[PDB]
Structure formats: structure tokens, C-alpha cells
Amino acid sequence: RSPGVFFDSDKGKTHSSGKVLYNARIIPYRGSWLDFEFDPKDNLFVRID
Amino acid sequence: NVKSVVNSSGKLVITSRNTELKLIDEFGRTKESYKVPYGAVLAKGDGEQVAGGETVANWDPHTMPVITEVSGFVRFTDMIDGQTITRQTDELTGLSSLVVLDSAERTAGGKDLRPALKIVDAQGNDVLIPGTDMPAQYFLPGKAIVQLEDGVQISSGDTLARIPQESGGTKDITGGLPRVADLFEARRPKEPAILAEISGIVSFGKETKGKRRLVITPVDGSDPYEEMIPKWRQLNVFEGERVERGDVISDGPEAPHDILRLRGVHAVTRYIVNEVQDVYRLQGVKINDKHIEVIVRQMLRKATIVNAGSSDFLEGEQVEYSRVKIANRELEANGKVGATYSRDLLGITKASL
């Protein structure tokens, strides 16, 4: 997988309501990853490594 | 299991979900069997004589409709624009088209709502189903398409909306083994078919927080059963009539545990055998039925005591059926009164452990 930023989502399989959750992942060539994610309650969340 | 009604043209439209059609020779021997889908149209009646090669029923296999029972004016109830439904407008005229959303794309405001179509009369009061005392309203599930406008006069037996259904994939052995494992693990279906727990007359009662209530009054004895059927559930029963154990209050997929509890051991073993064999018989595999019957026997090995009796078993313990039988046959020889139990159904993984 090439370095950069990728936008993905789960196809409602994580929540029984079938609500899709979207995330954006920044993956570098060398360093620490970064993740932005949506929760079922529509609250942006950040995640490191 | 036929429950039909006559449309405007004079044909017969099925309003039941488990209609079976059979061809019977003059000797009285059945020779052909077919299943009639909900909303199908029957050219001929029931009990009539037809010729070989004569069409008797027709339907559209790609869409499942909803057919009204009483004529009148259609109106929307709990149908909120842009929040629970999505509408498009044909700007060339006054027409429009509407799509009911699913719970996956609606806000919390529409989470507790329940959109539906209500049939009223000209006077504006609620039209009731003839023969009963219930309003003529129909709930629309997700992804349903309506082609009607508010206030439109509709005739009995006409379609109010259409519900598209998915196609599927190839029907090979990689698509039935999950069903076989589902049957042998005795999993519970997502939405069961509510079955009457006890026999007798039926009557409704108090309603709370969008939930109905069903009280079955036995013809003699106690009157304990008060079942809290959800309001969104569709029923086939009305106050005043009588039902027996194992009858279908609400249609849907069955649960093997309920079949075992209500109709007995033979019913559940027959259901399991038929369901398993209908997967293998599609692929040209031939297997005798003793082999499935012994597996079902191994699944039914546990019993839960319901009363201690003269035995030493506790009140709510689960034990082997053979041990209960041995203890009871030992006690009955001494003139005492043994204990009583209830058979259990366990999955193969859980039964083995």
C-alpha cells in the first residue's frame, strides 16, 4: 500500500443498526500513523498508532 | 391456508403468506403441489375443475406488493419529509415519487416513529376492516416505493406500494452449507413467528408505550398468559376467536425451540429433517433420513425439571433425560409420584461440551 492518505468506511458491519462509519488514515513512508474516525453518535475522534 | 379477496376485475388476490395449491385426482389423490406468493392473482377458484396446461395463477417475481383490503381514501400517517422518507418531484406535472428510508439513514427524531398508510372514508373517519373492529392501516418497511398521492381514492385489492427484493447468487454447495450449519447449531432466526403459547379464546387489553397485549382465556382452568406483542408486529388474530397451541399469531420464520416446546418432538424432528434434505436434494445428493434423525436425537438429550415431586432433583436444574427417566421409573414402582420435566434443544457444539 502506497504512502499517503486514504478514506475508507465499514459497511455497517460494526453496528447492528447498519450505520456506516467513515475513517481517514494517514500512513507515512516512515513514522507514526494517524487515524480520524466517526462513531455511531457522529463524534469525530483521533487515534495515533 | 388461503386468505384471499376479490379485486375490481373480479379475480382472486391472495392476502396470505403460506398459501398452498394442490391438484387432486378424481380418486382423491394429490398429484401436484405449488406455493402461491402473497399478492398473487388466481384465475380460477377453489375446488373447480381445470384442464391440463391451464394457467391458474400469475404474479411478478421481482417485487413484493402490499394490497389493500378495503376501498377508500389513502393518507399518510407518520410520514415526515426528508427525515423518515425521501421524495422526488416530477416538476413537469403535479406528480411525485417517494421512497421510505431505513433505520440505517434516519435521524433520532424518526427513530421512534412509524410511517404508515391509513385508509379513511370520505367523511374523514377511520375505515375498519369488515368483519372486525380494527383500523385499515398498513406499515411500510424500509426501501418501499409508493406511486400514490395523498387523498387518492383506491379500490380494494389494489397495490399501495411495492417492495423490491434482492436477486442472490449461484445456487451451489457453497451456499447451502451455511444453512445446514445453521440448522444443526439450532440458531434463532432474526425475527421469529409468534406462536400461541396456550389454547383457548383470545382477547386484547391494555396498551403501553407502543406495545400491544394479548390475553388468551382458556375455555376452562387458569387464565395466566399475557403476551406483550410489539405494536409494529402484524397479527392474524382478532378478539373473540379461539386458537390452539402452536398456531401462528404472526407469520415469519420459525424457531426450532418454539416448535419443540409447543408441538412436540416429532414436529421439530420433521422440520429439521425436511429443512436439511431440501438443501441436499438440490445438488443431486441422496442421503437416508436415519442419519439426520440420530443427529436430532443426540441434540435432544437434556431435560429441565419443573417440579421436584417425590424425587430429589431440584426445581430448576438441567440434567440428562435418561437419568430422569430412570429415577422416575424407579419411583413409580414404589407407588410414589415422580417429577416432571421439559425437553431442551441444544446445538451440536453446545451439546458436545
XYZ file of C-alpha atoms in Angstrom:
402
model
C 0.000 0.000 0.000
C 1.416 3.351 -1.077
C 2.056 6.138 1.455
C -0.415 8.970 1.699
C -3.981 9.434 2.936
C -6.864 7.026 2.325
C -10.577 7.372 3.066
C -12.444 4.174 3.919
C -15.560 3.059 5.760
C -17.079 -0.048 7.283
C -20.184 -1.363 5.552
C -22.381 -1.182 8.645
C -20.978 -4.465 9.970
C -19.702 -2.869 13.195
C -23.110 -1.590 14.375
C -26.323 -3.620 14.483
C -28.221 -0.579 13.160
C -26.274 -0.935 9.899
C -24.902 2.610 10.088
C -21.702 3.090 8.103
C -18.667 4.533 9.888
C -16.156 6.585 7.890
C -12.460 6.996 8.644
C -9.413 8.657 7.114
C -5.964 7.159 7.654
C -2.656 8.927 7.031
C 0.140 6.384 6.550
C 3.681 7.715 6.008
C 6.726 6.063 4.494
C 8.429 6.232 7.914
C 6.862 7.380 11.163
C 3.633 7.097 13.128
C 0.212 6.570 11.568
C -2.759 8.883 12.065
C -6.457 7.992 12.098
C -9.610 10.115 12.080
C -12.810 8.165 12.697
C -16.558 8.631 13.041
C -18.566 6.979 15.815
C -22.232 5.888 15.724
C -23.149 9.126 17.543
C -21.450 11.388 14.945
C -18.445 12.499 17.002
C -15.068 12.902 15.319
C -12.259 11.004 17.045
C -8.487 10.882 16.619
C -6.093 7.974 17.041
C -2.298 7.626 16.985
C -0.517 4.322 16.281
C -54.009 -21.770 4.346
C -55.676 -19.467 1.815
C -56.908 -15.973 2.743
C -57.938 -14.117 -0.411
C -60.153 -11.256 -1.568
C -61.810 -10.212 -4.824
C -60.409 -7.241 -6.745
C -62.249 -4.819 -9.021
C -61.868 -7.008 -12.121
C -63.392 -9.993 -10.296
C -60.300 -12.186 -9.920
C -58.941 -13.509 -6.614
C -55.895 -11.967 -4.913
C -54.117 -13.862 -2.136
C -53.618 -11.990 1.142
C -51.975 -14.913 2.986
C -48.269 -15.689 3.222
C -48.408 -19.523 3.234
C -50.948 -20.403 0.544
C -50.544 -23.907 -0.901
C -52.175 -25.038 -4.149
C -52.735 -28.725 -4.869
C -54.027 -30.800 -7.779
C -56.217 -33.729 -6.710
C -57.349 -36.540 -8.988
C -60.945 -37.760 -9.019
C -59.827 -40.632 -6.776
C -58.818 -38.021 -4.196
C -55.041 -38.484 -4.513
C -52.802 -35.417 -4.604
C -50.506 -35.264 -7.628
C -49.155 -31.695 -7.967
C -48.183 -29.084 -5.375
C -47.288 -25.405 -5.672
C -46.745 -22.389 -3.427
C -48.732 -19.198 -4.044
C -46.920 -15.955 -3.124
C -48.512 -13.048 -1.304
C -50.265 -10.744 -3.750
C -50.647 -13.354 -6.489
C -53.709 -13.341 -8.756
C -55.761 -16.518 -9.208
C -57.620 -17.036 -12.475
C -59.662 -19.979 -11.158
C -61.415 -20.570 -7.850
C -61.045 -23.200 -5.149
C -62.433 -26.675 -5.782
C -63.024 -26.145 -9.505
C -62.012 -28.482 -12.328
C -59.404 -27.349 -14.864
C -57.728 -28.863 -17.912
C -54.101 -29.905 -18.236
C -51.929 -26.991 -19.297
C -54.266 -24.279 -17.979
C -52.773 -21.255 -16.228
C -54.290 -20.738 -12.781
C -52.122 -18.111 -11.076
C -49.753 -15.299 -12.047
C -47.527 -12.816 -10.222
C -44.465 -10.602 -10.597
C -41.421 -12.404 -9.116
C -39.218 -9.308 -8.751
C -41.371 -7.108 -6.481
C -43.489 -7.970 -3.452
C -46.504 -5.634 -3.238
C -48.867 -4.550 -0.478
C -52.553 -4.956 -1.328
C -55.335 -3.069 0.425
C -58.366 -4.898 1.785
C -60.947 -2.076 1.997
C -61.642 0.648 -0.555
C -61.392 4.293 0.430
C -59.092 7.306 0.525
C -55.374 6.849 1.185
C -53.485 9.152 3.536
C -50.048 9.317 5.136
C -49.568 8.808 8.875
C -46.169 9.490 10.471
C -44.713 10.297 7.025
C -42.284 13.188 7.565
C -40.487 14.794 4.625
C -36.707 14.480 4.450
C -36.486 12.918 7.930
C -38.025 9.449 7.527
C -38.709 9.398 3.755
C -37.079 10.818 0.630
C -39.253 12.419 -2.043
C -38.562 13.352 -5.653
C -40.824 15.676 -7.643
C -41.717 15.386 -11.328
C -41.721 19.129 -11.966
C -43.414 18.731 -15.361
C -46.688 17.908 -13.553
C -48.067 17.682 -10.027
C -46.859 14.090 -9.637
C -44.106 12.829 -7.329
C -42.381 9.657 -6.162
C -41.438 8.638 -2.631
C -39.034 6.161 -1.024
C -39.177 5.022 2.601
C -35.781 5.179 4.288
C -34.252 2.515 6.512
C -33.141 2.755 10.134
C -29.562 2.985 8.853
C -30.031 6.514 7.448
C -32.634 8.186 9.689
C -32.106 10.697 12.481
C -33.045 10.122 16.114
C -36.192 12.186 15.565
C -37.534 9.494 13.250
C -36.027 6.641 15.268
C -39.184 6.145 17.356
C -41.624 6.994 14.546
C -43.604 4.518 12.432
C -44.672 5.686 8.959
C -47.753 4.015 7.512
C -50.638 4.397 5.077
C -54.126 4.877 6.524
C -57.376 4.107 4.703
C -60.175 6.532 5.566
C -63.578 7.284 4.062
C -64.942 10.477 2.518
C -66.122 11.674 5.941
C -62.545 11.537 7.274
C -63.134 8.857 9.907
C -61.052 5.688 10.044
C -62.268 2.828 7.854
C -62.313 -0.501 9.690
C -61.802 -3.965 8.220
C -65.217 -5.575 7.582
C -65.894 -8.425 9.977
C -63.547 -6.999 12.636
C -63.031 -3.797 14.636
C -59.526 -2.690 13.666
C -58.396 0.306 11.586
C -57.326 -0.307 7.993
C -53.693 0.793 8.145
C -50.578 -0.730 6.608
C -46.988 -0.229 7.746
C -44.316 0.316 5.100
C -40.890 -1.239 5.779
C -37.629 0.226 4.536
C -36.884 0.658 0.832
C -40.535 0.656 -0.253
C -41.723 2.642 -3.276
C -45.146 4.313 -3.357
C -46.702 5.687 -6.546
C -49.730 7.377 -4.941
C -50.635 10.866 -3.743
C -52.326 11.981 -0.542
C -56.105 11.626 -0.603
C -56.196 9.318 -3.631
C -59.234 7.031 -3.741
C -58.146 3.394 -4.079
C -60.159 0.232 -4.686
C -59.983 -2.888 -2.544
C -57.318 -5.318 -3.717
C -55.105 -2.728 -5.419
C -51.415 -2.292 -4.652
C -50.494 0.675 -2.461
C -46.701 0.229 -2.635
C -44.029 -2.133 -3.926
C -41.136 -3.679 -2.009
C -38.150 -4.634 -4.189
C -36.245 -7.781 -3.254
C -32.651 -8.762 -3.951
C -31.619 -11.341 -6.538
C -28.952 -13.520 -4.933
C -26.079 -15.530 -6.335
C -25.387 -19.006 -7.633
C -27.195 -21.940 -6.026
C -24.326 -24.373 -5.450
C -22.975 -26.302 -2.480
C -21.088 -23.257 -1.181
C -24.408 -21.502 -0.490
C -26.326 -24.190 1.412
C -23.744 -25.467 3.880
C -24.217 -22.281 5.951
C -27.920 -23.177 6.127
C -27.089 -26.754 7.155
C -24.762 -25.484 9.893
C -27.467 -23.003 10.950
C -29.968 -25.852 11.300
C -27.617 -28.181 13.167
C -26.474 -25.391 15.509
C -30.150 -24.570 16.241
C -29.670 -20.826 15.893
C -32.558 -18.422 16.429
C -33.851 -16.541 13.369
C -33.617 -12.763 13.383
C -37.399 -12.263 13.690
C -39.421 -15.325 14.759
C -43.078 -16.141 14.079
C -45.094 -15.552 17.257
C -46.963 -18.727 18.225
C -49.836 -19.069 20.680
C -48.451 -20.496 23.918
C -51.795 -21.815 25.218
C -55.137 -22.726 23.664
C -58.477 -21.009 24.176
C -60.266 -17.803 23.242
C -58.270 -14.611 22.674
C -58.784 -11.019 23.794
C -56.775 -7.804 23.855
C -56.155 -5.453 26.763
C -54.032 -2.519 27.921
C -51.643 -0.753 25.545
C -48.412 0.852 26.737
C -45.575 2.763 25.084
C -46.285 1.488 21.584
C -46.799 -2.142 22.591
C -49.983 -4.216 22.386
C -51.105 -7.019 24.709
C -52.679 -10.436 24.148
C -54.544 -12.411 26.818
C -55.567 -15.959 25.935
C -58.502 -17.089 28.063
C -58.699 -20.895 28.315
C -62.126 -22.476 27.972
C -61.508 -23.923 31.447
C -58.815 -23.583 34.101
C -56.495 -20.657 34.732
C -56.068 -17.519 32.628
C -52.395 -16.588 33.110
C -50.936 -15.794 29.709
C -50.378 -12.081 28.994
C -48.065 -11.769 25.986
C -46.549 -8.371 25.144
C -46.548 -8.434 21.353
C -44.727 -5.401 19.878
C -47.034 -2.895 18.211
C -45.130 -2.947 14.912
C -45.829 -6.686 14.701
C -48.621 -7.656 12.327
C -51.131 -10.134 13.739
C -53.548 -12.563 12.107
C -55.843 -12.741 15.145
C -58.709 -10.618 16.466
C -60.621 -10.501 19.740
C -63.323 -13.147 20.191
C -61.914 -16.088 18.237
C -60.174 -19.186 19.586
C -56.716 -20.591 18.853
C -54.846 -23.781 19.718
C -51.271 -24.365 20.844
C -48.673 -23.828 18.139
C -50.897 -21.717 15.898
C -49.424 -18.727 14.094
C -50.371 -15.438 15.731
C -47.880 -13.649 13.463
C -46.210 -15.014 10.343
C -42.466 -15.301 9.885
C -39.582 -17.766 10.053
C -39.929 -20.437 12.716
C -37.724 -21.112 15.723
C -36.928 -24.788 16.431
C -37.078 -24.251 20.198
C -40.665 -22.987 19.990
C -41.636 -25.913 17.756
C -40.158 -28.347 20.276
C -41.809 -26.621 23.239
C -45.279 -26.417 21.668
C -45.854 -29.104 19.032
C -43.549 -31.773 20.479
C -40.552 -33.839 19.444
C -41.921 -35.298 16.210
C -42.762 -31.854 14.822
C -39.265 -30.449 15.376
C -37.580 -33.591 14.055
C -39.753 -33.463 10.919
C -38.991 -29.764 10.446
C -35.240 -30.306 10.804
C -35.224 -33.338 8.502
C -37.189 -31.538 5.781
C -35.126 -28.347 6.026
C -31.830 -30.237 5.813
C -32.942 -32.547 2.997
C -34.223 -29.645 0.899
C -30.634 -28.367 0.661
C -29.022 -31.648 -0.407
C -31.800 -32.641 -2.820
C -30.992 -29.532 -4.889
C -27.422 -30.696 -5.611
C -28.363 -34.269 -6.532
C -27.075 -35.795 -3.284
C -29.001 -38.763 -1.876
C -28.910 -39.483 1.868
C -31.255 -41.545 4.012
C -33.135 -39.973 6.906
C -31.933 -42.229 9.734
C -28.654 -40.304 9.614
C -30.297 -36.952 10.324
C -32.711 -38.494 12.824
C -29.894 -39.825 15.019
C -28.243 -36.382 14.992
C -31.539 -34.832 16.085
C -31.750 -37.492 18.805
C -28.287 -36.506 20.043
C -29.437 -32.877 20.083
C -32.402 -33.745 22.356
C -30.630 -35.152 25.409
C -31.268 -32.586 28.175
C -34.297 -32.058 30.396
C -35.080 -29.270 32.859
C -37.144 -30.206 35.912
C -40.279 -28.161 36.594
C -41.411 -29.745 39.882
C -39.428 -31.725 42.440
C -42.142 -34.300 43.057
C -41.064 -37.244 45.181
C -37.630 -37.192 43.507
C -34.511 -35.494 44.879
C -33.949 -33.290 41.820
C -34.016 -29.537 42.384
C -36.606 -27.152 40.964
C -34.699 -25.502 38.116
C -31.863 -27.895 37.313
C -30.894 -29.291 33.908
C -29.935 -32.970 33.711
C -29.824 -35.934 31.349
C -33.177 -37.194 30.085
C -32.182 -40.830 30.634
C -31.348 -40.210 34.299
C -34.727 -38.545 34.868
C -36.437 -41.486 33.170
C -34.520 -43.980 35.327
C -35.315 -42.129 38.555
C -38.986 -41.762 37.626
C -39.352 -45.427 36.666
C -37.731 -46.345 39.982
C -40.097 -44.093 41.943
C -43.270 -45.152 40.106
C -42.594 -48.775 41.066
C -42.728 -47.816 44.766
C -46.139 -46.141 44.448
C -44.913 -42.549 44.752
C -45.353 -39.659 42.287
C -42.287 -38.739 40.259
C -41.096 -35.445 38.834
C -41.965 -33.696 35.578
C -39.610 -32.006 33.155
C -39.242 -30.222 29.828
C -37.111 -31.326 26.883
C -34.370 -28.989 25.668
C -32.868 -28.394 22.234
C -29.121 -27.778 22.071
C -26.707 -27.106 19.257
C -24.157 -29.767 18.409
C -21.268 -27.614 19.652
C -23.009 -26.875 22.954
C -24.388 -30.404 23.364
C -20.966 -31.993 22.850
C -19.379 -29.771 25.508
